[PDB]
Amino acid sequence: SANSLEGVIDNEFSMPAPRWLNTYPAGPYRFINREFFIIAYETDPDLLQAILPPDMELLEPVVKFEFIRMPDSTGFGDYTESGQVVPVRYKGEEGGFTISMFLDCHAPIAGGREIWGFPKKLAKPKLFVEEDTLIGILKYGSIDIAIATMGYKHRPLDAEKVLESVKKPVFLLKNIPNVDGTPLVNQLTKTYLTDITVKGAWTGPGSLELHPHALAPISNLYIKKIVSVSHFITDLTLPYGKVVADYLA
Amino acid sequence: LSANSLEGVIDNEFSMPAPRWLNTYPAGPYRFINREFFIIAYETDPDLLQAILPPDMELLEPVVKFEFIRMPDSTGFGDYTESGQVVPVRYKGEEGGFTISMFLDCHAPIAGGREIWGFPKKLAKPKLFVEEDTLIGILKYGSIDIAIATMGYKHRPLDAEKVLESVKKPVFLLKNIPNVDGTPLVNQLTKTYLTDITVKGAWTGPGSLELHPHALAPISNLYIKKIVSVSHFITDLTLPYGKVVADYLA
Amino acid sequence: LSANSLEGVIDNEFSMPAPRWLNTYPAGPYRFINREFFIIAYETDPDLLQAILPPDMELLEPVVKFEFIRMPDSTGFGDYTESGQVVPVRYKGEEGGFTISMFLDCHAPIAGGREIWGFPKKLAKPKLFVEEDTLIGILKYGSIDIAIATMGYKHRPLDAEKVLESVKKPVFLLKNIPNVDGTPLVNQLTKTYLTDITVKGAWTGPGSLELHPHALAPISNLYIKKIVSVSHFITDLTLPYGKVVADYLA
Amino acid sequence: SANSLEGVIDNEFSMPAPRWLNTYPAGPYRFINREFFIIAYETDPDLLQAILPPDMELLEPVVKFEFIRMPDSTGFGDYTESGQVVPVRYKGEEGGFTISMFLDCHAPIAGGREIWGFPKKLAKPKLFVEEDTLIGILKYGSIDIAIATMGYKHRPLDAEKVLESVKKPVFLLKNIPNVDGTPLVNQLTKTYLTDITVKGAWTGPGSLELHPHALAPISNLYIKKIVSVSHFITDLTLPYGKVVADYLA
Amino acid sequence: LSANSLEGVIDNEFSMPAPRWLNTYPAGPYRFINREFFIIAYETDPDLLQAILPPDMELLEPVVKFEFIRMPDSTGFGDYTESGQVVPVRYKGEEGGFTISMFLDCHAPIAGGREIWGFPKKLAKPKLFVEEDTLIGILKYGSIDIAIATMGYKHRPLDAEKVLESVKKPVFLLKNIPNVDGTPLVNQLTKTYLTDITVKGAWTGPGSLELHPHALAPISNLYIKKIVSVSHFITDLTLPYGKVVADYLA
Amino acid sequence: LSANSLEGVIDNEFSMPAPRWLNTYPAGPYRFINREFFIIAYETDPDLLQAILPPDMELLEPVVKFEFIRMPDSTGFGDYTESGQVVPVRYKGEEGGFTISMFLDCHAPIAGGREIWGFPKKLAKPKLFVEEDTLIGILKYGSIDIAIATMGYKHRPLDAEKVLESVKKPVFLLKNIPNVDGTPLVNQLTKTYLTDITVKGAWTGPGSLELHPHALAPISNLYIKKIVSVSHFITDLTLPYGKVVADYLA
Amino acid sequence: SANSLEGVIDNEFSMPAPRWLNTYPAGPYRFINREFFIIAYETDPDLLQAILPPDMELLEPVVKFEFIRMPDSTGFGDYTESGQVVPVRYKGEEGGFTISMFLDCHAPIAGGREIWGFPKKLAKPKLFVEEDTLIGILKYGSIDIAIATMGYKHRPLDAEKVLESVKKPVFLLKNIPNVDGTPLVNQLTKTYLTDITVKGAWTGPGSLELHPHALAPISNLYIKKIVSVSHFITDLTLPYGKVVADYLA
Amino acid sequence: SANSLEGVIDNEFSMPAPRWLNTYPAGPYRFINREFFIIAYETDPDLLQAILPPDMELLEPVVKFEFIRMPDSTGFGDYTESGQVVPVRYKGEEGGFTISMFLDCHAPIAGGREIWGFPKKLAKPKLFVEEDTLIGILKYGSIDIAIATMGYKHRPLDAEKVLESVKKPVFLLKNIPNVDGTPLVNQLTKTYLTDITVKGAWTGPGSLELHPHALAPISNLYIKKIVSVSHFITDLTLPYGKVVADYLA
């Protein structure tokens, strides 16, 4: 019996007063065979507008619903994610604004929330193939809150346009309370994924169904129609980012 | 058809100028009914403990209090279980506890715990249960049982007033959050006092504790030299907000 | 060897001149301990509701209160769970509730409910439970989940005196029984007041509801426009006898 | 999603003020392959006389213990029944008086109790064949309260006599409290089954065993000896009946 | 040891000059005993329906008849279940049905159905069963329940002669087969009449239908505006061969 | 309490001067409804067959009829399944069948079969069922599958009058019973005619059979050269008493 | 694949015209560790007298209810038995008359019935030890028809007396119909077990409970009181016997 | 809830009158990690000769029994195949003639049959490794109709010769009835696989066992001896083909 640890020697983030029990290591983080299944749908533009932070503009009244399989992620492990991203323009720059995310592994949850500010919660996303269908099921406790399907790699999709999309900035609200119940941190962060390879990309018919849940209200962003269906597989790196706005300043 | 009462960012519980649409935990204070504690205090190596403590905090005794806490009825956070290690300390001349490890089976209190007060919480599978004549605590992290605690069921009474005085002692915590650029953003010592506490019952008896290693939950690093106390008590109490008492980035 | 305490029908609970030997439910009143309510009130089409109301009954608001009720300790009736829909109404200048649908997993309270007061009860499989951070109600009818309700667990306190005032409101029911020749025998409006009520706790929080159709449990006809309220409360109370306030066969 | 209902338009029993939620439809009710297994036994006549209502004659101190399989019943569905019927005489007319009944489906329970006044409770009766034996087991909760066996179709039984038996009236006490705890209804009803076909009938050796239950005290009518054993299959109709006595007038 | 009666290409059931050794389905006609139909007809968007219809075919009503059909005893094809959507149409002044979707749990009738007449058959898991007081139809495609239908068990009789006249109406189908080069080979409208039909029983009652989306089984695209009929009937009938009535490659 | 209708042995079904108290099977005749036959006839070594035949019995053709028979409704004997082998024969100028092996999953018809007519029946687990497109017969003896038969389901009609003529043929059997001293007591040839036969349907199609060895069920000794016929038919018929036509101990 | 059979060459009972398919081989049959558990009880003598054949004396109105474990039996295999034996006297010779028998293996059933004339039926008897108790349960289909318990080897029993009992003749009615429905065989047979060794014998407290079944009416012989309880293990041989009466001559 | 479809817009094969419900998309179809396990065996040349279409000649009296794992097939999905291919010469050209095929996914079945004319049926083929053995099991309903085994990659096999083999034409009989029960289509098609990479190839000891089935008579082509054992893994493309003979013309 032994641990290689011992003890606050591994101070991954260079804290003057470090915490003995670590939850996540430092990055950057390498992703091999990071596999995206995205169903973009039109919704009510007002619901979306109401959610965006100051000076951020909606590129279109669309939610991008994703399932992401991350079977080999350095530091974070072997897990799956599902969530909702909104296409936006901020200060002249087009990117995405993540409004919901669900993972089945705590290290990337605590890390995602505490480093960049991803709005991550614990749930049970699954991405898998059953015969000729690619399926994503997002379960939250006992309830299936999203079911997406796609015809398996029916047609190819231009991998260069996908790369262009993956290269777009990732905008997040990093909100952390103070121990006294008031705000400590309320920031807009921006992060760019690096060293990306799109190994393959496809399109096909798709479907999405959402169901309500008091603590995962993703169904609030109701589906007017599906505007796009994508499946692609990548290797990429998630590096550190930067604060672009501080609302407490 | 269907609906959610939400919509949304109208429920801004921590008064963020620019709120996040998807909430993870509500505002407190948080009320606990039948919060049940099973604690085995043991002596370990003082040097290990002292190495872990922040600046200016003193170790009261070379002791870790290994706990299992059942929280079946917790406002805001739910129905869950916790297990972890707490060290007795003195800070600015005030005696209290310093939490060095904590593991729970529900994410809401995990996220709330880490982000509000700074509890060093990870996700695992703690269990506290009675098996015939024994109270058992088992902490499983993934596939691995990393802690097993046992106790003779309510063998002898324990002075409830003394337990109450212990629960009243401040809770000290290192609240550590990275900046998005990978450097430190927050590195604070926080202090919180549990309130409105009723000790509804307390007992002692014979006890045992076994620990096993894990790379990501190195609790066994604080090895057991001998068991120095065994306690079981049940309570109703409130977890309110707290205060920053040191800022190491200052 | 063996034996039954009865024999009997010396047990004529309702004082029938000519009693039935096999009893299905005893006489009340009936006492409930930890009768636990989870209610999501939602706006619907007022015309649908109006169509359903008996003569001279007025609709207070175009709202359906969808409920899950856990009855773990009910004198005479046992340990069971209920789900249903109740409409706020005014009858002869008095506000109360009119129950339009009800589903239980225990037959004694079904038969007694239908035959004494006139509750519109059917057999099904409702369930109320907590999972982690969430309070859940599922109503299964056969193989089909016809209602799913969720709530953030005890997120905020709710005024218990307001809850009490609500529980004290009259219960109106259409008691409808055919004659053996297929024409109506009984078609009454009854009114009953719950008594000896204690609201032991009460809470609110974010909520959701989803309904699914069923030919024999068409609750989904009362479609959800929006959720207007979410409540959770626990009580001790008594269900006594009531009175006939209208006879539609007169 | 949709329901064909909409709504209080379906008023099957012509109530001036109908209930929106229906539990059973109107009859008459058609039964295909209604299958009977009856072990008739001698018991204490005084216990039986004590149960019978005023002016009803006990024909013989016999209980007919039955299991009835109803796989195809219009309005009521696919279910199973077990119970006890006494041979009686009312105003000179021989018939049966049902003193206990147990079914595994609620629609025929509520309908049975509320229309004709069958003394129906929810349980789990089963009628099945295993090898060489016809078996009936009545389980009430976790407790098996009756077990009947018979040698499978060992000998024929006269179907004509069976038919005569099935044609005999059904006598029932229909007892309903008032919302105030006093009696509202206390009637004797009489119903005749119609359009009966006995498709087959047999006899053979039989056995019956009873066990106590506080809420299903069928064993109170103890077994002195088995007097007959019958198995028969029919098609028949359950129509409406009539009130023949009112103990409240 | 062992043997097969086969060998082989001696069994050339469709009189191919150059037969295939491995047969998939035998020749008909095909006889069905206790072919059981459960149909829920509903109103949908007429524009969706009209867009789907071939040239010169007219929509009779803006209605889809959603069906579950149990076929426990089918000569040649076996013991199987089907579910699908049929539209009422007129072609060359003849009223009939146009099948737009069909799903079965056995491949023989799938291959035979597509290749002989041109039924738009895919493989799935339809089920038709009785559950207490309810007739239920569930169509599952892979992991996904894409249709749920319920009905009150044989609540009221239905005129058997009228059902017989409906079953006698022609079956119209688009028989579409690619050439090996990826261009069209066959694009025909076929017409077939069911024969030797006995309607052994027919009923109606309250009904419900729920649909869910699927990329590869988009049945929910024909959304439900309201249910307009509910039917259950059982039959014996024969499925014989049919005729080509349009050739769109001509 | 409890009771059996018997007592008895007042039930002397076979009119024994000194009856046995515990009965194993009642007296006939015995009526079978939906007695369902699946028969694969195959050519084998005629010498093997000849060796098995009793004196003065002639083999009609070097064929074994391998059968699976489903008996779901048999007066006196119950609900059971059979598999066996029957040889076409001529005895005293009359053609019929000689049963050489038989396996049932119900003991009453085993004992009655052996002790009344002389059927060579053993206990085993034969099964006849449809899976999709295929009719299947499996004969399991203990843990070992000793026969597997398959057929394309009702692919073609079979002349039912020919089937009827076949079912009407005499059943020949060697009834062999030892004496308690280990020497022969009974060694008879019996002959029995099935009566009141209705062939309700009959079909043919492609078929297969596979046999596996077993020390105590050596059916595979009668190896398959080729399959000569495949039949499936359903009947109602009666099994009555028969007669002794040879006594080999005389 | 091959069978050693080939074929009607195996004529174990020297039939002039042998049957190809054998069900049991010839004896004698050797039993190792044949284990007996017997609860002897008093019952109604008149019921017993009614069952016994002409000129057989009832020694006492007692039924010996047995469970016998036969894990190693030449020719017949590994099986279990339960049944009822009556102490009788035939032509001055004390022995046992078996009135009911149940086994879980068909070879010893057919052989038992057809050679000596044991009244054997197929069921599921079990004999096992659980903790401190020896338990015998006889299940007939889905129904447990007998349950016997005993305190495990509480006290010794004289093995010499046990041996004397086991050496007593076995009397049986061998009854076989003619193919025409009339009697063919109706004999009383007598057989003596040979080469017996009683390896151990015990007594202790015991219990017996019986339940009815139409096709296994063992409960008809009701229990007035338990008169003896025995457990013993043996090695013994079952040989051929002789006919001692023929009721057809 | 929504589908991206709507509706006959996706007319994959350019039908003047398209079918609303699609079963399979247009090709060509890309296969990644298409894995072949083939046991070639000698059989009776006359059985084979009798099956071949006009002017087609048997290269050798051999059947090639294959299991093929297709875990990533664009348009068709994730499935497995097993079947029998015969080496043939047609009009001077050597290739293969497929006589049986079984798949566990309907899209490639309907597609294979309706486009090229593969004689495909639904079953349950499995290909997998268990310790040091590569195993293929073909189950049809309840029956195991083929079991093949191989020593795992015992020796390498010349990948260039394998490529040469995979490049050979695929000859098929495309037979489709008319709605009136007579022939509509009776064609010989020829197709060539393209863009092939043999990533690896091996040989080793092998075995094959076949069992009969009325509706999958693969055992008719009995095994005289195994002549070759191959395992190889490929990426390749299945494109459209051409009609080479029309027997209805």
> For the sheet containing F207-211, what is the strand order?
E2-4, F207-211, F144-152, F134-141, F125-131
Residue H182 · residue E116 · CB < 8 Å: no
| Alpha helices for chain E (secondary structure H) | 46-52, 107-112, 160-167
Q: What's the token pair of residue B173?
A: 């915590």
**Residue H85 and residue H93: Cα distance in Å, rounded?**
16
Q: What's the token pair of residue A163?
A: 């790369």
How far from chain centre, in Å, is Cα H233? 15
Q: What residue ranges in C161-241 does DSSP mark as E strands?
A: 171-178, 184-192, 195-204, 207-211, 226-239
Residue E54 · residue H17 · CB < 8 Å: yes
Cis amide linkage into residue B19, ω under 30° from 0: no
Q: What's the token pair of residue H77?
A: 């999905």
Three-state DSSP state, A1: coil
Q: What's the token pair of residue G35?
A: 């284990």
From its phi and psi, is residue H74 left (phi > 0), alpha (psi between -120 and 50) or beta?
A: beta
Of residues D230, G30, D131, G12, the one with CA closest to residue F111: D131
Residues in contact with H246: Cβ distance below 8 Å, sequence separation at least 6, in sequence order: H186, H187
Residues in contact with D45: Cβ distance below 8 Å, sequence separation at least 6, in sequence order: D58, D61
**Residue G53 and residue G55: Cα distance in Å, rounded?**
7
Instruction: Give me the half-sphere count of Cα atoms (radius 13 Å) on the Cβ side of residue A70.
Output: 25
**Residue H35 and residue H141: Cα distance in Å, rounded?**
24
State yes or no: is C121 an active-site residue. Answer: yes
When scoring E5, E75, E236 by the number of chain F Cβ atoms within 10 A, the one with the most, hence best to mutate, is E5
Q: Does D211 touch chain C (CB under 8 A)?
A: yes
Rounded to a whole number, what is the distance in Å from the CA of G152 to chain F's nearest CA?
30
Residue A8 · residue A18 · CB < 8 Å: yes
Phi, psi of G106 (to 5 degrees): -75, -30
**Considering only CB atoms, which chain H residues are within 8 Å of E24?**
119, 121
Q: What's the token pair of residue G98?
A: 């078996």
Q: Chain F 108-167, CB below 8 Å of chain G: which residues?
A: 108, 110-111, 114-118, 120, 122-123
Phi, psi of F118 (to 5 degrees): 100, 20
**Considering only CB atoms, which chain A residues are within 8 Å of B238?**
none
Q: What's the token pair of residue E124?
A: 């799935």
Residue H198 · residue H164 · CB < 8 Å: no
| DSSP letter string, chain G | ---S---TT--TT--SS--SS-S---S-EEEEEEEEEEEEEE--HHHHHHHSPTTEEESSSEEEEEEEEEEEETTTEEEEEEEEEEEEEETTEEEEEEEEEEES-HHHHHHIIIII---EEE-EEEEEEETTEEEEEEEETTEEEEEEEEETT-EE--HHHHHHHHTSPEEEEEEEE-TTSSEEEEEEEEE--EEEEEEEEEE--EEEEE---TT--GGGS--SEEEEEEEEEEEEEE---EEEEETT-
- What is the distance in angstroms between the CA of the first residue and the CA of the last residue of chain E? 54
**Any idea of the CA torsion for C49, C52, C54, C59, to the nearest 10 degrees?**
0
Contact check, Cβ <8 Å, F117/G173: no
Residue E175 · residue E117 · CB < 8 Å: yes
Per the DSSP assignment, residues forming a β-bridge with B129 are B136
The residue of chain G nearest to residue F17, with distances taken between CA atoms, is: G247
Q: What's the token pair of residue F131?
A: 């899976």
Of residues C206, C233, A124, the one with CA closest to residue B3: C206
**Residue F160 and residue F163: Cα distance in Å, rounded?**
5
User: Computed from CA positions of residues G139, G140, G144, G150, in that sequence, does the dihedral angle turn out positive or negative?
Assistant: negative
Residue A25 · residue A75 · CB < 8 Å: yes
Q: What's the token pair of residue A171?
A: 């905008």
From its phi and psi, is residue C78 left (phi > 0), alpha (psi between -120 and 50) or beta?
A: left
CA angle D93, D98, D100 (to 5 degrees): 170
Fold designation for B19-250:
Acetoacetate decarboxylase-like (2.40.400)
Three-state DSSP state, F220: helix
Helix (H) or strand (E) holding B46: helix B46-52
Residue H231 · residue H32 · CB < 8 Å: no
How far from chain centre, in Å, is Cα G88? 15
Three-state DSSP state, D110: helix
Per the DSSP assignment, residues forming a β-bridge with D122 are D103
**Residue A56 and residue A78: Cα distance in Å, rounded?**
33
**Residue B22 and residue G79: Cα distance in Å, rounded?**
67
Residue G191 · residue G243 · CB < 8 Å: no
**Residue G67 and residue G86: Cα distance in Å, rounded?**
15
Q: Chain E 220-249, CB below 8 Å of chain H: which residues?
A: 220-221, 241-244, 246, 248-249
Residue F44 · residue F225 · CB < 8 Å: yes
Residue C212 · residue C144 · CB < 8 Å: yes
Cα–Cα distances (Å) from H151 to A135, H145, H165, H202, in that order, read 36, 21, 22, 10
User: Computed from CA positions of residues D23, D27, D30, D35, in that sequence, does the dihedral angle turn out positive or negative?
Assistant: positive
Residue E68, amino acid: F
Closest partner CB to G212 (pick from D131, D137, D209): D209
Please count the residue pairs, one from chain A and one from chain H, whose beta carbons lie less than 8 angstroms apart: 62
Q: What's the token pair of residue F98?
A: 């000689």
Residue E167 · residue E228 · CB < 8 Å: no
Helix (H) or strand (E) holding F80: strand F78-91
**D18-249 maps to which CATH number?**
2.40.400.10
Q: Based on C-alpha coordinates, what's the Rg of chain B?
A: 19
Of residues H121, H135, H23, the one with CA closest to residue H75: H23
Three-state DSSP state, H214: coil
Phi, psi of H78 (to 5 degrees): -130, 100
Of residues E190, E198, E196, E192, the one with CA closest to residue E169: E192
**Residue F185 and residue G185: Cα distance in Å, rounded?**
9
Three-state DSSP state, A185: strand
Q: Does H1 touch chain A (CB under 8 A)?
A: yes
The residue of chain G nearest to residue F141, with distances taken between CA atoms, is: G106
Stated length of chain F: 250
For residue D28, how many other CB atoms are within 10 A of its CB? 14
The domain ranges of chain F are: 19-250
Q: Tell me which DSSP letter residue A15 carries.
A: -
- What is the distance in angstroms between the CA of the first residue and the CA of the last residue of chain F? 54
**Residue A134 and residue H14: Cα distance in Å, rounded?**
25
**Residue C23 and residue C7: Cα distance in Å, rounded?**
12
Stated length of chain G: 249
Q: Based on C-alpha coordinates, what's the Rg of chain C?
A: 19
**Residue C66 and residue C147: Cα distance in Å, rounded?**
9
Cα–Cα distances (Å) from B196 to B76, B164, B168, B170, B190, in that order, read 17, 10, 9, 14, 20
Three-state DSSP state, A105: coil
Residue A173, amino acid: L
- What is the distance in angstroms between the CA of the first residue and the CA of the last residue of chain C? 54
Q: Tell me which DSSP letter residue C7 carries.
A: -
Task: Tell me which of E65, E92, E121, E191 is the catalytic residue.
Answer: E121
Of residues D1, C205, C206, the one with CA closest to residue B4: C206
Phi, psi of E21 (to 5 degrees): -60, -40
Cα–Cα distances (Å) from F114 to A195, D178, F174, F238, in that order, read 82, 66, 10, 17
Residue found under tokens 């006009």: H54
| DSSP letter string, F167-183 | HTS-EEEEEEEE-TTSS
Helices and strands (H, E) in chain B, number of each type:
3, 17
Residue H202 · residue H132 · CB < 8 Å: no
Q: Chain D 52-91, CB below 8 Å of chain E: which residues?
A: 72-79
Residue E222 · residue E44 · CB < 8 Å: yes
Of residues F179, F119, F121, F52, the one with CA closest to residue G17: F52
When scoring E145, E216, E220 by the number of chain A Cβ atoms within 10 A, the one with the most, hence best to mutate, is E216
| Alpha helices for E4-116 (secondary structure H) | 46-52, 107-112
Q: Tell me which DSSP letter residue D53 carries.
A: P
The technique is: X-ray
**Residue D208 and residue D137: Cα distance in Å, rounded?**
10
Of residues A131, E85, E127, E66, the one with CA closest to residue H19: E85
Neighbours of chain H (3+ CB pairs under 8 A): A, E, F
Cα–Cα distances (Å) from C218 to B26, C59, C69, F205, in that order, read 35, 20, 19, 48
From its phi and psi, is residue B50 left (phi > 0), alpha (psi between -120 and 50) or beta?
A: alpha
Q: Tell me which DSSP letter residue E116 carries.
A: I
Helices and strands (H, E) in chain F, number of each type:
3, 17
Of residues E236, E170, E160, E226, the one with CA closest to residue E197: E236
**Considering only CB atoms, which chain H residues are within 8 Å of E174?**
17-19
Closest partner CB to C216 (pick from E133, E209, E210): E133
Residue found under tokens 């017993």: G48
**Considering only CB atoms, which chain B residues are within 8 Å of A22?**
216
Stated resolution in angstroms: 1.6
**Considering only CB atoms, which chain C residues are within 8 Å of A142?**
131, 136, 138
